[PDB]
Motif scaffolding. Structure first.
Motif, PDB file in Angstrom:
ATOM      1  N   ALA A 111    -112.839  66.463  26.001  1.00 10.72           N
ATOM      2  CA  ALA A 111    -112.859  65.065  26.394  1.00 10.72           C
ATOM      3  C   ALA A 111    -114.277  64.661  26.781  1.00 10.72           C
ATOM      4  CB  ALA A 111    -111.843  64.802  27.526  1.00 10.72           C
ATOM      5  N   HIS A 167    -114.603  63.846  22.668  1.00  7.58           N
ATOM      6  CA  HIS A 167    -113.291  63.222  22.905  1.00  7.58           C
ATOM      7  C   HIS A 167    -112.578  62.672  21.670  1.00  7.58           C
ATOM      8  CE1 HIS A 167    -115.679  59.484  23.052  1.00  7.58           C
ATOM      9  NE2 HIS A 167    -114.566  58.899  22.669  1.00  7.58           N
ATOM     10  N   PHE A 204    -108.484  64.411  21.531  1.00  9.25           N
ATOM     11  CA  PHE A 204    -108.036  63.744  22.775  1.00  9.25           C
ATOM     12  C   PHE A 204    -107.543  62.321  22.488  1.00  9.25           C
ATOM     13  CE2 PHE A 204    -109.538  61.604  26.917  1.00  9.25           C
ATOM     14  CZ  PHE A 204    -108.528  62.110  27.737  1.00  9.25           C
ATOM     15  N   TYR A 253    -103.537  61.008  22.844  1.00  9.23           N
ATOM     16  CA  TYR A 253    -103.264  59.830  23.660  1.00  9.23           C
ATOM     17  C   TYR A 253    -102.525  58.744  22.790  1.00  9.23           C
ATOM     18  CZ  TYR A 253    -103.894  55.282  25.800  1.00  9.23           C
ATOM     19  OH  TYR A 253    -103.644  54.049  26.307  1.00  9.23           O
ATOM     20  N   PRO A 303    -104.172  59.136  30.324  1.00  3.49           N
ATOM     21  CA  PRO A 303    -105.111  60.217  29.976  1.00  3.49           C
ATOM     22  C   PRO A 303    -106.062  60.490  31.113  1.00  3.49           C
ATOM     23  CG  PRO A 303    -105.867  58.147  29.004  1.00  3.49           C
ATOM     24  CD  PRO A 303    -104.606  57.831  29.762  1.00  3.49           C
ATOM     25  N   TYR A 304    -106.479  61.735  31.255  1.00  6.14           N
ATOM     26  CA  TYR A 304    -107.382  62.100  32.330  1.00  6.14           C
ATOM     27  C   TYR A 304    -108.177  63.349  31.943  1.00  6.14           C
ATOM     28  CZ  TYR A 304    -103.615  65.378  33.945  1.00  6.14           C
ATOM     29  OH  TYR A 304    -102.640  66.353  34.008  1.00  6.14           O
ATOM     30  N   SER A 305    -109.284  63.597  32.643  1.00  9.90           N
ATOM     31  CA  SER A 305    -110.215  64.636  32.231  1.00  9.90           C
ATOM     32  C   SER A 305    -111.005  65.208  33.394  1.00  9.90           C
ATOM     33  CB  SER A 305    -111.113  64.084  31.117  1.00  9.90           C
ATOM     34  OG  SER A 305    -112.016  63.115  31.645  1.00  9.90           O
ATOM     35  N   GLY A 345    -109.476  67.556  28.622  1.00  5.27           N
ATOM     36  CA  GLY A 345    -108.500  66.495  28.813  1.00  5.27           C
ATOM     37  C   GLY A 345    -107.042  66.900  28.834  1.00  5.27           C
ATOM     38  N   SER A 385    -110.504  61.302  37.829  1.00  7.33           N
ATOM     39  CA  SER A 385    -110.227  61.928  36.519  1.00  7.33           C
ATOM     40  C   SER A 385    -109.646  60.961  35.541  1.00  7.33           C
ATOM     41  CB  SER A 385    -109.263  63.139  36.624  1.00  7.33           C
ATOM     42  OG  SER A 385    -110.025  64.210  37.153  1.00  7.33           O
ATOM     43  N   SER A 386    -108.803  60.055  36.050  1.00  2.00           N
ATOM     44  CA  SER A 386    -108.059  59.119  35.202  1.00  2.00           C
ATOM     45  C   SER A 386    -108.795  57.816  34.922  1.00  2.00           C
ATOM     46  CB  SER A 386    -106.656  58.931  35.762  1.00  2.00           C
ATOM     47  OG  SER A 386    -106.756  58.326  36.989  1.00  2.00           O
ATOM     48  N   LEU A 402    -111.669  56.961  32.972  1.00  2.06           N
ATOM     49  CA  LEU A 402    -112.542  57.463  31.921  1.00  2.06           C
ATOM     50  C   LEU A 402    -113.762  56.554  31.776  1.00  2.06           C
ATOM     51  CD1 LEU A 402    -109.592  58.210  29.558  1.00  2.06           C
ATOM     52  CD2 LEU A 402    -110.755  59.835  31.036  1.00  2.06           C
TER      53      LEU A 402
END
Ligand SMILES: CSC[C@H]1O[C@@H](n2cnc3c(N)ncnc32)[C@H](O)[C@@H]1O
Ligand SMILES: CSC[C@H]1O[C@@H](n2cnc3c(N)ncnc32)[C@H](O)[C@@H]1O
Ligand SMILES: CSC[C@H]1O[C@@H](n2cnc3c(N)ncnc32)[C@H](O)[C@@H]1O
Ligand SMILES: CSC[C@H]1O[C@@H](n2cnc3c(N)ncnc32)[C@H](O)[C@@H]1O
Lengths: 292, 292, 292, 292
Positions: free
Chosen positions: C195, C200, C204, C208, C220-222, C233, C272-273, C275
């Motif tokens: 990600a 990404h 990823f 998603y 989505p989060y990373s 991710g 994290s969420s 982006l």
């Protein structure tokens, strides 16, 4: 200590040289071309990511490839190189005072033009009035012209089935294309790939054996090249005998070759041509013959 | 391939072997010890991060180091190894039917025990009743015992100034310590470092010339060791001549040595002892003598 | 400094860790298995020459994969892992006091047996009476049993067309196999590959987007994983909302999870969420949907 | 691929980039200079064998370093860069319509001229009439001139004890040199080293805590830089608050900045300034202050 050139010599074996710079490039449809300026080995010509010639030690490969064949000849006058675009084979041939004409036949004009400009060790060779450069596949050139030669020199890549140079190592090539273009007393020599204690079985023994099917006298020989991380090999082949003493070879070098050789004297050649127990054994028992 | 052992074998030059595993390690006052399982060369003994012996090709070094010296002796019975903790020198010496006693004098017991435990190919050699292991400096050990030997074998590190092995390569050592412990007709052989086209000037030429100051007959010779990516050197030395034909050597191997050598036959030794032009010139023009 | 593990992360980019040892191995028909003892990252599980989990930082990947999904659930009781033979996903799930049952469904019994013995961080997890190990392709297992779950966790390899795990990332898998096996309020989470700012786009964004075609709410989060040399991710998906504050998440962690998390708190998840501009933009504009 | 640049970015950890070429080199009293043409990251500036700026991702570092500080100022007009010889900091500052003067004070003229000659992306920035280049130590330069700035930007090396840049990170420097050269409402921002899950304890937490001793409002933030294989950190510091919404930030970018940022939007800054659990805990518990 940050920039390195790396080559996988054999798989699971990497040889790495510290890099000063990446000096010049070309590329043709035939191969990628690069000149690297390396710390341990000086300037290094690399084709398709494979080291061909390093400044510090290419004299070993070119003196071994050229001088034994010419010196075994009573009076070598005209000579054809299969490949040789790098120019050093030509340079070495042209040190022979007996030579009137060298034909360099390389398939890749980009190699010739690149090396002519940037491998400046060969500058005088490339400008020698005795050199004729031909751009062509060597097998086509030999088949197409009637001219015969005193020595023919193979300076091509190893024979790999399906590959571009294979057909210039077959029994049929040697017998039908090559031998008709040698004069009486003519000598063929070719590079014959790795000749190490294990590596000699890859192509060296097959080349020796293939030549054995066509020419009466066949003399394999080898020498270490530090930059190659191996022993390399060459094979002489002729229908006239190939048997001179170390001193006979020395006398011929002093009379016929301009300047002193740096690698090769007569004793060196005698030693080169005395292969080790296991290598002699593989060459003697080899049954594979390259055909197409 | 994912795992590599890397060694900088010369400045700006890296030699890398893919690894299966790291088998065992050890240490002493004198050095760190490791046994690697490598893809190109099998199990490899490394001391202070320097490759010593690899399974696939150590036969070359050990046959070269041992057999010429014994074969040139009329009847070699007792032999003293300076170093040889790794055990392959012993292994080769014990292949001779004439041998009744082998003294391995290595300074580092950890090396001895490590190899005795983990180098399978030498298990049998370490348990041979002719083999006696002595843990000492070989110089002190030779001075402190009046016993004399038909052959003495130098299996040490290269003489580096201020290094632990330097003193076992000096004129005074050879003249006053080693020569008095050779029986009449005695032969000394030592490993003598790299013997490559350029690397031969580091120690090989100086070891040759130093021995020349002390023994009447001195014969240098060399062979490629794939795992070292160089030619390696040895020197024979004796006050009797060291001169047999290839054919004599081969008969003597048949008479005296159990099973077939893998590397060395008579012609291989002849080739080995015929050095190339530049190497012969260095050895013959050399003037450095190792002294305290 | 001599032994190294090397991986080509992206081509023309190599990540190298100094090696202490190669500790244990297996291999199955499914993949090569190795446990390396590395200097920078400790013990490292490598599958098919690709690092999966490093001792020092695998907690980041396993806390990010597991805790957000469970914490967004009001009362997660039973949970199915697709893959997870390494055992750390299970370990993290089992820290939840609400969990009655974890089914670990891995296709490769050799991975499970190897990690159970040698990834000893997971020893107590593997011996937790709540864990049931199933050896099977996860898609076959889910299709074949009627049991529904509160959370399903994908811990498989990236979807590569023609590859073994692809079919567990398709729209049809999520819609026809996966969603019927989620209870009301159920949450799916899957690992979703690199990600990074450039990386990404590889899988990823497609993961998603694919989830977006099936589930109403997709988050989505990373997070960075140092040993991976990239941002990694994950994607949450559910037909019930996924919207909790940082403090709500913290309260839930303190109540429901045994011990303190080392990586993740509520603020960490919120970050994290969220982006970055370019990653949000690719995810929003993505049109590729995995199908088969 | 044959040619590699290798950097040991942490003990026992090597990061290697395949090379197209080595473009140019230089040197000064302060450092060696090189520009590499790399495959994964384009042209890369290396100083003393340490990667500084790579073409493919330097936008991230430079947008992060510059834009938050200016966007939080009501009307930033004059700005002083400590370091910035590479020119990308200037490039980004000059994207702001409010800016009328940019002082780049770098100690090493060779760096300035090297980049001005060879970093094409900054050509226009170096020739902007608002840009003034000063060759000096930024500490001496600040002490020796009474002029004050709306924003000061730290674009130096990490504070290493006994190193050349250490003194530009001390409490006394900030309090007695830098703070008196900020106009009322002034904002300082500095690069603050690695900000990874473990690497954040080297300097990032100490830089945060040092600034906390001197400025009322201090905002740390971070972002992944692919070419560094780590998260990197920056810290804003001011005696006025540094608190805008994502939406405010986005409006302000639209109003003030020429063309679209590639990395940073408002939500990206919010995410950047929300540190993970362990990093926030280190910053908040830190007690080291940098002092002479
Ligand atoms: C690496 S091959 C060495 C040289 O042989 C040349 N070469 C390859 N194939 C042929 C051919 N069939 N005829 C002549 N030269 C060749 C290449 O262009 C290169 O310079
Ligand atoms: C790699 S050095 C080869 C062997 O020589 C041994 N060695 C080094 N110096 C001496 C010495 N002075 N006497 C005996 N053996 C030695 C080492 O322990 C090693 O096994
Ligand atoms: C590297 S893939 C990560 C894990 O997923 C497992 N795995 C791969 N394919 C499947 C599958 N179809 N079902 C369940 N587990 C799988 C592998 O055995 C490994 O432990
Ligand atoms: C890699 S360090 C970043 C920049 O800071 C410059 N630099 C280092 N120390 C100082 C200093 N004391 N004042 C100004 N610039 C500096 C260097 O020349 C380089 O371009």
């Amino acid at each position: 200590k940050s920039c390195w050139y790396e080559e996988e010599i054999e798989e699971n074996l990497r040889w790495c040289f510290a890099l000063n710079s990446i000096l010049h490039t070309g590329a043709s449809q035939y191969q990628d071309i690069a000149l690297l300026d390396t710390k341990p080995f000086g300037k290094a010509l690399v084709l398709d990511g494979k080291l061909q010639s390093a400044e510090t030690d290419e004299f070993i490969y070119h003196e071994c490839l050229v001088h034994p064949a010419l010196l075994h000849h009573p009076m070598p006058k005209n000579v054809f190189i299969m490949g040789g675009g790098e120019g050093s084979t030509a340079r070495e041939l042209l040190r022979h005072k007996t030579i009137d004409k060298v034909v360099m036949c390389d398939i890749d004009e980009e190699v010739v033009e690149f090396c002519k400009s940037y491998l400046v060790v060969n500058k005088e060779a490339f400008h020698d009035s005795r050199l004729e450069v031909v751009i062509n596949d060597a097998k086509a050139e030999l088949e197409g012209k009637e001219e015969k030669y005193d020595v023919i020199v193979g300076d091509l890549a190893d024979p790999i089935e399906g590959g571009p140079c294979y057909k210039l190592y077959t029994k049929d090539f040697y017998e039908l294309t090559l031998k008709p273009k040698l004069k009486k007393g003519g000598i063929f020599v070719t590079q014959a790939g790795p000749a190490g204690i294990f590596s000699h079985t890859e192509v060296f023994s097959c080349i020796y054996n293939t030549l054995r099917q066509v020419f009466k006298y066949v003399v394999p020989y080898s020498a270490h090249i530090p930059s190659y991380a191996d022993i390399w090999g060459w094979v002489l082949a002729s229908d006239s005998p190939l048997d001179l003493s170390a001193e006979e070879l020395d006398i011929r070098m002093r009379q016929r070759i301009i300047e002193e050789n740096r690698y090769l004297d007569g004793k060196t050649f005698v030693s080169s041509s005395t292969l080790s127990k296991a290598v002699r054994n593989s060459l003697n028992n080899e049954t594979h013959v390259y055909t197409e």
